[PDB]
Symmetry: D2
């Protein structure tokens, strides 16, 4: 029965063609949904009660579009998101972190606009986790956004939105200085011929997967759900294909900001992403990611590939990783393991931001610290196991891969262990 679920017959195929031939509508997804859902918060999804339903439906990142509303309006939305999120902190083995992303208005006819400088300052003051920088055309646009975030906003992730021909042509220099990319198909579909957007999307997703950096697929994914309770056949296909292309995140704009079915749109993206993640041909994907990833003498990078290889060898239910900044979880995520990457962190901000990396399930550690650092690490690993059991990721008898470091502090990941559950 285990080998009939999660498209495992299609996963064992010797060619991509045979893998497609073996895809089965009766093979149910079992693994947790790996692709994060970004929901735009607006009039239809602002209330605390509505936000609780959206968190339960699967929203991982709340996007505030600074092209609309005001600072007062967006601060109220942020407060409602935080109130809805913290309303679940009662059960420590089930709490779900939710990131807050600020999407800028953009430069318009002009460097960094004066409104963007003020909105970026608002983001820093309100503790946003991510900035989706509109109309990034070159590396210097990213540097300007980074400067406007100042010294207090050093830890904020900058996801550059590629929205025009110049951004596509200068993609490599933009990706080099950004934390990640957003394929902003709305403007891209007006800036370049509409029939070429899929080439830009597939190229950028492939290059971000190669670089090990997050990539978001955005705009009109479930557009008809703004007024209708069910999406079109093209819309479900678009969501599934963004996941199969390799997108770390999928986004909802008007579907959640102003539409009549915000919760249903999140549930639809969740249901499609789960099905599409099981349909990924890991045999080819892992081999290609492995071959293309450069040789490295960084112990975190070396441990990450060893851990992902070990996870595939035993059909590991999860890879539990201890991380301060999210980096060790990101390096595991770049190899696209089928095993969930359960990231146990004390940083509330890192827990929110690792939603940008596919297959990373953040757990915020809130238990008393042990006197012995070796015993503290073991408590954090046991926390990951207990949360995993409660959430359905793990069961007694499962094998897990545990990734830890040799000394406290960020940058010292170097250990992989094979653990049997209970």
């Amino acid at each position: 029965a285990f080998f009939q679920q999660q498209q495992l017959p299609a996963a064992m195929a010797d060619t991509f063609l045979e893998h497609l031939c073996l895809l089965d509508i009766d093979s149910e997804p079992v693994a947790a949904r790996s692709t994060s859902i970004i929901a735009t918060i607006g009039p239809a999804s602002r209330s605390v009660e509505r936000l609780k339903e959206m968190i339960k439906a699967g929203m991982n990142i709340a996007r505030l579009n600074f092209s609309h509303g005001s600072h007062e309006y967006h601060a109220e939305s942020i407060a409602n998101v935080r109130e809805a999120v913290e309303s679940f902190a009662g059960s420590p083995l089930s709490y779900r972190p939710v990131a807050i992303a600020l999407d800028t208005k953009g430069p318009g006819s002009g460097g960094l606009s004066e409104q963007d400088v003020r909105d970026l300052r608002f983001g820093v003051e309100h503790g946003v986790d991510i900035v989706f920088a509109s109309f990034v055309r070159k590396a210097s646009d990213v540097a300007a956004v980074r400067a406007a975030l100042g010294p207090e906003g050093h830890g904020i992730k900058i996801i550059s939105k590629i929205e025009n021909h110049e951004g596509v042509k200068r993609f490599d220099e933009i990706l080099e200085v950004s934390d990640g990319i957003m394929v902003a198909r709305g403007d891209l579909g007006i800036e370049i011929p509409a029939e070429k957007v899929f080439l830009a999307q597939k190229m950028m997703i492939g290059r971000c997967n190669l670089a090990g950096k997050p990539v978001v697929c955005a705009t009109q994914m479930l557009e008809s759900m703004i007024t209708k309770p069910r999406p079109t056949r093209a819309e479900t296909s678009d969501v599934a294909n963004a996941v199969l292309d390799g997108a770390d995140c999928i986004m909802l704009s008007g579907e959640t900001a102003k539409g009549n079915f915000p919760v249903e749109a999140v549930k639809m993206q969740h249901a499609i992403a789960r099905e599409a993640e099981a349909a990924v041909y890991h045999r080819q994907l892992f081999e290609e990611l492995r071959r293309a990833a450069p040789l490295s003498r960084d112990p975190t990078e070396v441990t990450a590939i060893g851990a992902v290889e070990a996870a595939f060898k035993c059909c590991a239910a999860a890879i539990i990783v201890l991380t301060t900044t999210g980096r060790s979880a990101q390096l595991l995520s770049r190899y696209r393991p089928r095993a969930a990457v359960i990231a146990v962190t004390r940083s509330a901000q890192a827990a929110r931001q690792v939603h940008l990396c596919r297959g990373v399930f953040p757990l915020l550690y809130r238990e008393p610290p042990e006197a012995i650092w070796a015993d503290d690490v073991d408590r954090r690993v046991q926390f990951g196991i207990e949360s995993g059991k409660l959430r359905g990721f793990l069961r007694v008898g499962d094998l897990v891969i545990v990734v830890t470091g040799w000394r406290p502090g960020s940058g010292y990941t170097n250990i992989m262990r094979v653990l049997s559950i209970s």
Copy 2:
């Protein structure tokens, strides 16, 4: 000899990549498509696209197959639409650069247990009106196809039956249905109501993959450009859906309400044409050909053996086209199953085969009407040169190009066994 400019067009840098991941990384929005659009467009003919003048614009925009949905209208209404399609098609017989065969497909209302009374009458209407294809609704098992086949009376055994898979049973019994059908339609409208909407993409990818492996045509249908029923431009999900159907391996893409009743029928055809051309150049032929080769069983049929040799030869020299002589369309279909990048120019005397080969990706039919030469080898050479001169006229070929020419050793269908490499003079 060819030039660096040649190797920058039609996603040739992405085509040379050693992995699928590197192929995606090399896709370039500035690399322009050069080859003719190979995925056929099926347009549903209804009130918005019924007039002879509108049909001429749809043919110019790229419509290859006219679909008549017998779930709506009447026999009289559909006969008038068929007459208008044939009048619009024959209005271009005076210009070789514009004349294009257009197939006529009848889409049945559907089943009750067996074949419905109305379907028996509509299938009889199809035979009497000389339709080329039947899109059989709600095919659930092999016996449903046999019933449709039996209904195509004594005169319609040459009509292609494309079985529409619209529910759980059709998906589960897919292999037995494909075995007795000429092809498959992934009918996503009903499929998305019969099975969970989030599972339709799995059924689509599986059926397209299995049809590609069997060498049989597969149509992707329903809501591909849905918003274009009321809007002049499609959504980002819609253009992606059309491109991904082509990348999945679909031989045909379809328009339903977009052309039957919408405000932008011609624009919807133009949009499918533009997207399919871009998507066909983005196909990773290096892996596709290797996998089609490895999965296809060994064959002692000369047509099949010649077809793989011709496709291998075409890739080796970047041949502008593979010109094939065919009476039934079968030799062109066997070339199409290996997904050559070279256009398959099929020269035929059969007007029906010319219309029907639109079901096979990359087949460009040329109907030949010259009287037969007394010496067969001369009649063969005349048809080969007709394909080259039509190719030159349409932009497929230029002097100095290499073409692969597929023929047989004796007249009559079923004897293809020769592949030749010709330099265009």
Copy 3:
């Protein structure tokens, strides 16, 4: 039949990985195909008699090597005459006649910077006596090959120059030497003294791989069955060395003292024949063909394009043979570079080309002696029928087999462009 698929290591041939291919090799799976790696036998006192040379031709000797490091011009002229007498003794039965090449192996440069004056005289003797191949000793750079070519003069333009790589400089300048040579000999005797003995296998494997990639003949030479100079059976290392030279991709394997001066010249030829047949069936064609195709550049030469199409067609149907008409041997060489499992039966009127194509693995030359038919197409057909009749007599073909036939569109060399699938009747 199931019996067909158990022979010639076909279970190992279908394996999905090289490791599984090795695991499926079966000592009970008998070789069926004709031996495709040519055997070069050095002529000396143990192999000079006309009667002994007839036994060596029957055992499998394809090329007779004359070693100009020993004996006078008078001795080599008698060797040539004896070889020709033994070869022409079988000319009375044209369907079974086996051409045998005569290769001249030069003394070399010695302490000098390039072409010696003895080499100049010996090379002129070769042209005057009609040698087919020169094995140029101690080639260190491209200018050494040009000097050999100049010493052959205007009458020796058709002689093949196989450069012997025997020292460090030759290995380091390999690419420039291969570019101007017709092929290479891995001369392991001197190579094993010029470079560390434990490195010779790396030089052998590298040069064989680069010659396979270039589509040029490579010979593996020296001490392959050394112990058979005095013993009737070889050592375990010797049989392994011959099998591994074939698995590496060598077109030819050589015997030196084993046939020139040893006690078992005929047995040494029979042993190389038996090993080579076993090793050729053990070649993992699935990976080899895929790698040869991926590495071979795109080509606009119709002979090369037809050759890859013909090899692809032959693999698709398990063709017993590829029958090719050739004037210079070039069309057969271009088929051979893709390493088909099907035997390449080359029909030619050129006695020299028939001898020289032995340098290419899997090419079986047939010398056609009939004068040309008045109708060119009939002359082509008669030559194809001669290939079929010789093939049936020799065991290559049977009624019911499929063969691929490669011909051209006009008389004269350079116009191969047609591939055809023929059923043997």
Copy 4:
């Protein structure tokens, strides 16, 4: 180039020109062959073990010290010749020559002692074999090369004749005839490893078919993760000549490229005029051939073919080998009691040396059967705290590694350990930087 650019800037272009690294990075086997370079020098320690037959030409303690220095890892005693007294004296001389270097862990070299049986002659285990096997147990031999194994019951008979005191002895079944080849799978299943005995095999089956049997058995042993020895006439002419033939060097190189864990010398060391030179020649060829292995395809094929495993030692071994390839690790240091954790690393054919730290003198000798395993015998008494004892053993491996030239400051090493004492609990992989 992009997959090696940062590491090329760090380690240098000179590093990437040695040990056939340009051929190792090739995308196809054909391009890998085209990139093999006679100027690319081997750097890694020789990983294929050399089995030398001990006889009249190689029996003296002084000669044996030269053979150990030349590279002999396993001393074979052929019970088809000599007597119990003769073989006991050879064993004592091997042990005296081996223990003469026991003054330091950076000079000590464990050497296994293998007993090769006479065989059954004309069906069951012969009476002479029962006595010779009893001699082996009494003299503490590490391995038995069982002659003419034809079926699984032949290896059970050898195991029974070894008795309750010889349970730890490795049984390597010699495949010497058609029946042994045909019943190979059942024989490998119950044996510790295999020997392709080409001498008898070349007389029992057609000589032109021996290479098929050799390549098939080596491939199946590689797939099973069990040791395979290539034997007989590898350097035959070196019995009387100081240099081998071109076919002989090719045969040794091709046995290593085929996947043999061990290569053997018979008359070359037992009775020949150049025993030390024959060992040196096998050492030099094996080092060149190991660097020429196309690891990219080999590792991918070993992974595709190996079934999924829920054994933590197996899971840790593949993770450690993957990690070693990612950073061009100089070594994988593994703690082992029986040799099993080192054997599971060896089955994935890492380019990194597997330095196996063990307290078992017998396991240190027996791991020579596994390609790429370098045994270090740890002699210190156990620390009070087990975690400290583990750390001391890992540091012993690092210090021996530095002293012997396997490791340098700045190198990355992979360290493989377990969660509790005792055999069977390996489950940890660590990446350590050498300081």
